[PDB]
C-alpha cells in the first residue's frame, strides 16, 4: 500500500500510451474514484481523449471500492471485454491498464461465505486460483491481434507470498515488484532489482551487451545486500579496497536506479527526465566499470541519465 | 506404458504445488474437512500415490524405468510448508533452488550444500564419481570458510588454498541454458578444476576459459572424450594427455 | 515478531559469529608469537585498548620497546574481543531460533484455527 | 451536507479499529462466518465505502468538499498487518506516529520514511 | 541417510538374536518402495534373513506411502503384534525398529482429519498424546519378557519444541545420534559419543563402576574438543603434561568407540566383533587409566575387546 | 479427608501439562472454539478450581491441612507460555529446574534466582 | 492480547509490568517506557515535572536502542557521548526501582513512600550529571536521592 503502483502505471500511459498508434482500455476495479476522476481530466487535457470528436484513442471502464463486491468482481471482466473486441475484430495493437486486478480477488472473498464455501488458506475463496485462470487466460495476445497488458497488483500487508499475488506471478511474462523498504530511502520509483523479472531477459533477445550489463548490476547489488548487515555490526575496516570499493558503486546504482517521473512532479519537487535504452546501459556500464568513482553517490540520486549526476556532482560544491 | 515394455521415460510434473491447489478446491467445495493450510487430510496420499510409480523394473518385468522431476514451489523458502514437506518426504532427495544464488551470478541457482540424491554414486558413472568425490570434499571444506572471505585479513596459506579451489569450482558449476553437456565434457571441465590448473587463472575468467578449452577439446581432442568413457574413468593416458592441453591452452590464455 | 524478519537477523547473525570467531583464531596466532618475542624484546577494532591509551593522553629504544608491548596487549584485546562477540553472537542465534520456533508454531495454529471457525459457521 | 452545498467540512473518525470491531460482533452474531482474523469478509468494503464519500466536488456542484481523517490504532508497531494495510490502501497518504520516536523527542512523532501523502504540493500553497 | 543406518539395525538384529535368542520386527510406517525393496535385498544379503533355512531372525512389516493414512497409521500396531507374540509366548526379549516414529504420527493426523475433528496446536491431531501413549505402553519389560523399540525419528523443521517430536520424547529411555561428521572420521559406526543419551545411565542402575567409566569417557572427550582451538592456533607445543595425554587418551578411546560389524563382513573382507559389556567397561576404564598409552592409535581403530588392541599394535609396531 | 479431619497431607500432581493436554483432546473432540495453543477457553479453571482445594484451615476447622506440589513441563525454558503462566498465577511460588544447570551436572538443578515461595518464610524453621 | 488490548482504553494512567525488568531485580517491575498518564501535562503536573519525566524517557529511550550494539560487541565501540548516556541511563533504571513496605519480605529492606518534590530532584541530579561519581548499585533499591549517596559512601 503506497509504494507506487498507480504513479508507475500512470507513467507508462504518459510515455507507451500517448505514442501507441492503436486503441487502448483502462479498467479501474477496486481502486480510488479520485484517481478515476483525475485520470479523466488529464486525458481530455492531452487529448487522448477527445470530447468534441471521434479522435479518442482509450475506453475507459470504473468499478472503484465505493461499489459492492458484485461490481468490483465483475468489473475487469467488463474493461477486458471492451480490450478484447478490439483486439479480435481489427487484430489492431490493443493497449490494455487495469488497476489493481487484485480488486477482482478481494472481491469474491468478500462474498464468499454468504456463498456457502469453508474458506481456504489466509481467508481466500476455494476457486482462487481457477477463478483467476478463466480471467486471465482471456488477458492475453492471440493469432488474431495483440494485447499489451499492464495489470496494477495489490499485495496484502507486503507480503508478497499472500495467496493472490502469489497465484498472479505465473500468469506473467514480466514482473515489476515494488518494496517499501526501498520506497521509505527515497528511491522511486520503489522497484526491487533483485525481485524484479522479464521473460525477454535473455542474451539471445535483448543481446550480450545489454543482459551482462544487467546481470552486473544484479550481482553487484545482491553483493552488497548481503554484506550490509554484517558490516553494520563488525565496521568497514576489514573490508580489503576492493571490497570497499565495490560497495560504494552498489550504493551509487542503487540510487542511479532512481528517476523522477513527469507524473510524480507533485512528489518529488523535480522535472520528470526519460532515459532511452541505449543512455540507460551506458550509465550503468560505466558505473560498473569504475569509471565515476571519483562522483559522490547524492550525484546519482534522482536524475535521469548518467550525464545529469555528472552535473549534480558539480553544483554539489556549494 | 514405456516403463512395462521395456523402455524408459522421464516425467516431469510443473507443478504439485499447483496440483495440490486444484484437489484443495475440490475437497472444500465437497465440503471434506479442511487441515493445515486448508488442506484436505489424503492430501499426502494424492502426491504418494503419483511418486511411487515411479521405478525401476527388474530383468523378469522388462528392465524398463519411470524417472520424475516433480516441481514444488516454495513460498520465501519455507520448505517446512505443508505440501513441500509431504514431497520432501515422499521423494528421493531434492534439487534446491535459490533467489540469492541467481542474483549473485549462480546458474543454475543450486544450492549444492542442501541438494542431495539418496540414490547418489548407484547412478553416477566411475568417470564422473571420481572427479565428483573431489569436488564434493573441496567444496565441503570451501563451504566451512567461505565467510571468513571478506574479513579473513591475515589467513593462513591452508585456509586461503581453500578459498581459491572453492570459488573456482563454484564457477565451474556455473552454466548457461539450453546447453545440457555430455558426461565426458564435464568431466573435463571439473577436472581441471579439481586438479588445481585454475587456482592460478582470475575468477572472472574461469567461466571464460571453460568455454574456449571445451570448445577446444571438443573440436581437436575427441579421441581423448571417448576414451574418457570407455576406460570409464580417468585412465593413465587420458590423465596426461589432459595436463599437456590444459597446461598449453591455459598459457595461451594468460598470454 | 515475523518470521521473514527473524530469518534475517539469524542470517546476519550466523554471519557474524563466523566472521567474529576466525577474527579471534588470527589474533590468537598473532598474540602467540608476540608473546614469544615478548622477553627478548624487553631486553633493548582491539577491545578498550585504543581507548584507554587515548582517553589518558588528555628515539629508537623507546619506540621498539612500546611498539613491542603494544602489539602484544592489542592482539590480546582483539582476541578476547571477538572471543566474547562470537560468544554473544552464538547466545543470540540460539534464543532467536528459539522465538522462530515459537512464532512458527503460533502462525500454524492461528491460521488453522481460522479455517476451522469459518467452515464450523456454514 | 456542507459538501454538497458548497461548504467544506473536515470529519475525524477517531477511530476505525474500534468500529471495525464492533462490526466483527454484529457480523459474528448475526451467524456470518468469520474470515480473516474472525473480521468479515468485507471488512475493507467497511471501510472503502465510507472514505470514498470524502470527496472535492466540482464548481458544478458547488466546488465544496469533505476532507476525512480516519484514525487507526497498531498493535505493536506492525503498519503492515491486514486492518492497517487495508485502510492505507483506502486514503490518500497515512502520517504513522510511533513511541520511539515520541520517547527520543520527536514530536509529532511523525515517522518521515513511512508516511506519505498522495496529493503532493497541489495542497500546498507556493510558499510552502 | 547414509549414516550407516541400515547397517547398525541389521547389526543389532543379529546381536540381539546371538546374545539373547530373541528376534527382531521391522516396522516401516510409510515406506517407500523403492527403499523396502532395498532393505530387503540388503537383509538377504546380510544373512539377517534368509530365503532357504529358517535362520531368519527379522520379520518384516511394511505400510509404503502409496497407502491410505489408515493403513500407515495402523502398520506399528501390525508389527507390534508380531513382536507380542515373541514376547508373550515365546518369552524371549524381542527387538522392534520402527521407522520413523514421525509419519506415524502425520498418519495420525491425516486419519483424524479426514474424520473431521478439530485439529490441535500446530495441526496435530486433538489424540496425538493418546495415540501415541497406547502405541508405545505395549512397548515394555513384563514378567514374560520384553520388547525393546528402536525408532527413527524425523524432527519437522529441526524444532525440538515440535508437539510431534515432544511427543514422542515423553517415552524415549535413550538416543543413538548417527552423524555424519563422524562418518566422515570413518570412525564406525558413526556413532556421536557426546549427544547419544540414555536415562539409564544412573549408578543406581549400570552399577557405580560402568557409572564412573562412561563419565570418564565422556570428561576425556569433552576436554579434547575444547582444546582443538588451543592445539591448531597456539599450536600444540606448549600442551603440559596432564594437556598432552588427554590428546593421546581422548584420541585412543575415540578411535576404539569404533567397531567392526559383523554385517559389515561380506565387504569389509574383516570379521564382525561383538564386545561383551565387561570388556568395554575394562577396556575404557584401562586407557583412562593410562594403562595402553605406549600403544599406537591404529592399534584400536576397528577392533574388539580391549586384547585386540594390544595385538593390532605389536603387528603394527 | 486428612485436610478437613485435623491431618495434614500432601498431594503431588505429575504432571499437570498432560492433564491440560488430555483435557484439550476432550474440549477439542467435543468442538469447543480453541484458543491459544489450542487450549479451550477454561484451561485456566481446569487448574485453579483444583489447587485453590489445597489449604490450610485454621483451628476451628480442625487446622489440617492439604500441601499441593504441581508439576509444568516447559518447552525450552518458555516459562512465558500459556500453561505455565496459568498455573504461575495459581500456585504460592515456584522452583525453577534449568536444563543448563542439569546438563552442566548441577543437581538438583534449581534456579536459586528464579524460584519463589510467597508464603513459606513464615513457615520457615528458625534454625533456618 | 484481546483482553488487555481492549484494556487499555478505559485507563486515565497505566502501570505496565515487566517480567524482563522484574527478573532484573527492578521493583516495581515497572516499563517506563509503556507506562502513560493522560495528567502528564505542562498545565497540570507543571514543567518542571513534565521536563524532567520526557528527559528521563529520551534516555531510556536512548540506552535502548544501544542496546543492539551492545549486545555483540559490548560497550568498547561506543564513542564517550553513548557511554555517557549508558551510565545515566543505568542509574536512571535503578533509582526507578523502590522498596515496599508489603514487599520487605522479599527485598529485605524498609519501605520508602518518597514525595513528589524529591521524586523529580533526585531525577533532575542524575540527569544533570551531578551523580556521574557514584557506582550504580547505589542508585538500586533506596528511597530519596539522598540514600543514594549514603549508600554510596557505605560501599566506598
Ligand atoms: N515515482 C515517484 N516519485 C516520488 N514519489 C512517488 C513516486 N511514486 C509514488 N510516490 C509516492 O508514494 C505515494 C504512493 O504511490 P501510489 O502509486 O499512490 O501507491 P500505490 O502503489 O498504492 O498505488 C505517492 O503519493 C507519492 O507520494
Ligand atoms: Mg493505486
Same mark, same amino acid.
Given at each position: 500500500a503506497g509504494v507506487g503502483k498507480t504513479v508507475l502505471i500512470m507513467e507508462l500511459i504518459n510515455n507507451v500510451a500517448k505514442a501507441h498508434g492503436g486503441y487502448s482500455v483502462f479498467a479501474g476495479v477496486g481502486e480510488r474514484t479520485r484517481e478515476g476522476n483525475d485520470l479523466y481530466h488529464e486525458m481530455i487535457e492531452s487529448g487522448v481523449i477527445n470530447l468534441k470528436d471521434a479522435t479518442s484513442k482509450v475506453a475507459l471502464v470504473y468499478g472503484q471500492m465505493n461499489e459492492p463486491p458484485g461490481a468490483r468482481a465483475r468489473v475487469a471482466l467488463t474493461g477486458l471485454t471492451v480490450a478484447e473486441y478490439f483486439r479480435d475484430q481489427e487484430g489492431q495493437d490493443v493497449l490494455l491498464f487495469i488497476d489493481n486486478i487484485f480488486r477482482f480477488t478481494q472481491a469474491g472473498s468478500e462474498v464468499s461465505a454468504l456463498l456457502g464455501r469453508i474458506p481456504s488458506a489466509?481467508?481466500?475463496?476455494?476457486?482462487l486460483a481457477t477463478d483467476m485462470g478463466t480471467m486471465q487466460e482471456r488477458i492475453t495476445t492471440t493469432k488474431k491481434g495483440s494485447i499489451t497488458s499492464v495489470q496494477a497488483i495489490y499485495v496484502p500487508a507486503d507480503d508478497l507470498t499472500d495467496p493472490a499475488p502469489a497465484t498472479t506471478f505465473?500468469?506473467?511474462?514480466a514482473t515489476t515488484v515494488l518494496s517499501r523498504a526501498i520506497a521509505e530511502?527515497?528511491?522511486?520509483?520503489?522497484? /526491487?532489482p533483485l525481485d524484479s523479472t522479464s521473460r525477454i531477459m535473455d542474451p539471445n533477445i535483448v543481446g550480450s551487451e545489454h543482459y551482462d550489463v544487467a546481470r552486473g548490476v544484479q550481482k553487484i547489488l545482491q553483493d552488497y545486500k548481503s554484506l550490509q548487515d554484517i558490516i553494520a555490526i563488525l565496521?568497514? /575496516?576489514?573490508?580489503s579496497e576492493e571490497d570497499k570499493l565495490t560497495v560504494s558503486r552498489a550504493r551509487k546504482i542503487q540510487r542511479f536506479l532512481s528517476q523522477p517521473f513527469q507524473v510524480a512532479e507533485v512528489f518529488t519537487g523535480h522535472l520528470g527526465k526519460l532515459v532511452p535504452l541505449k543512455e540507460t546501459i551506458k550509465g550503468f556500464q560505466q558505473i560498473l566499470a569504475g569509471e565515476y568513482d571519483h562522483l559522490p553517490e547524492q550525484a546519482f540520486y534522482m536524475v535521469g541519465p548518467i550525464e545529469e549526476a555528472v552535473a549534480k556532482a558539480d553544483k554539489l560544491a556549494e | 506404458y514405456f516403463r512395462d515394455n521395456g523402455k524408459h521415460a522421464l516425467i516431469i510434473y510443473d507443478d504439485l504445488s499447483k496440483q495440490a491447489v486444484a484437489y484443495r478446491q475440490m475437497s472444500l467445495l465437497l465440503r471434506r474437512p479442511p487441515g493445515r493450510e486448508a488442506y484436505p487430510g489424503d492430501v499426502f496420499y494424492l502426491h504418494s500415490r503419483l511418486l511411487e510409480r515411479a521405478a525401476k523394473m527388474n530383468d523378469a518385468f522388462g528392465g524398463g524405468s519411470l524417472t520424475a522431476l516433480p516441481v514444488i514451489e516454495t513460498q520465501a523458502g519455507d520448505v517446512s510448508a505443508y505440501i513441500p514437506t509431504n514431497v520432501i518426504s515422499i521423494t528421493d532427495g531434492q534439487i534446491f533452488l535459490e533467489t540469492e544464488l541467481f542474483y549473485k551470478?549462480?546458474?543454475?541457482?543450486?544450492?549444492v550444500g542442501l541438494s542431495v540424491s539418496r540414490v547418489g554414486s548407484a547412478a553416477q558413472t566411475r568417470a564422473m564419481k571420481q572427479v565428483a568425490g573431489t569436488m564434493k570434499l573441496e567444496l565441503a571444506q570451501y563451504r566451512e570458510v567461505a565467510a571468513f572471505?571478506?574479513?579473513?585479513?591475515?589467513?593462513?596459506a591452508a585456509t586461503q588454498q581453500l578459498l581459491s579451489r572453492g570459488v573456482r569450482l563454484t564457477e565451474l558449476l556455473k552454466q548457461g541454458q539450453y546447453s545440457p553437456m555430455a558426461i565426458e565434457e564435464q568431466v573435463a571441465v571439473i577436472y581441471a578444476g579439481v586438479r588445481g590448473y585454475l587456482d592460478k587463472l582470475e575468477p572472472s575468467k574461469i567461466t571464460k576459459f571453460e568455454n574456449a578449452f571445451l570448445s577446444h577439446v571438443i573440436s581437436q581432442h575427441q579421441a581423448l572424450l571417448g576414451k574418457i568413457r570407455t576406460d570409464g574413468k580417468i585412465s593413465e593416458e587420458s590423465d596426461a594427455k589432459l595436463k599437456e592441453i590444459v597446461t598449453n591452452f591455459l598459457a595461451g590464455f594468460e598470454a | 515478531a515475523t518470521l521473514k524478519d527473524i530469518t534475517r537477523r539469524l542470517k546476519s547473525i550466523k554471519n557474524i559469529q563466523k566472521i567474529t570467531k576466525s577474527m579471534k583464531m588470527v589474533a590468537a596466532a598473532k598474540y602467540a608469537r608476540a608473546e614469544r618475542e615478548l622477553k627478548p624484546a624487553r631486553v633493548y577494532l582491539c577491545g578498550a585498548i585504543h581507548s584507554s591509551v587515548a582517553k589518558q593522553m588528555k628515539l629508537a629504544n623507546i619506540i621498539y620497546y612500546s611498539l613491542k608491548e603494544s602489539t602484544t596487549s592489542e592482539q590480546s584485546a582483539r582476541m578476547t574481543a571477538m572471543d566474547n562477540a562470537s560468544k554473544n553472537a552464538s547466545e543470540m542465534i540460539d534464543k532467536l531460533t528459539l522465538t522462530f520456533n515459537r512464532t512458527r508454531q503460533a502462525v500454524i495454529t492461528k491460521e488453522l484455527i481460522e479455517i476451522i471457525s469459518g467452515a464450523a459457521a456454514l
Open positions: 489466509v481467508g481466500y475463496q476455494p476457486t505465473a500468469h506473467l511474462d530511502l527515497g528511491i522511486y520509483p520503489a522497484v /526491487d565496521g568497514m /575496516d576489514e573490508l | 551470478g549462480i546458474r543454475p541457482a543450486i544450492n572471505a571478506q574479513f579473513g585479513s591475515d589467513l593462513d | -
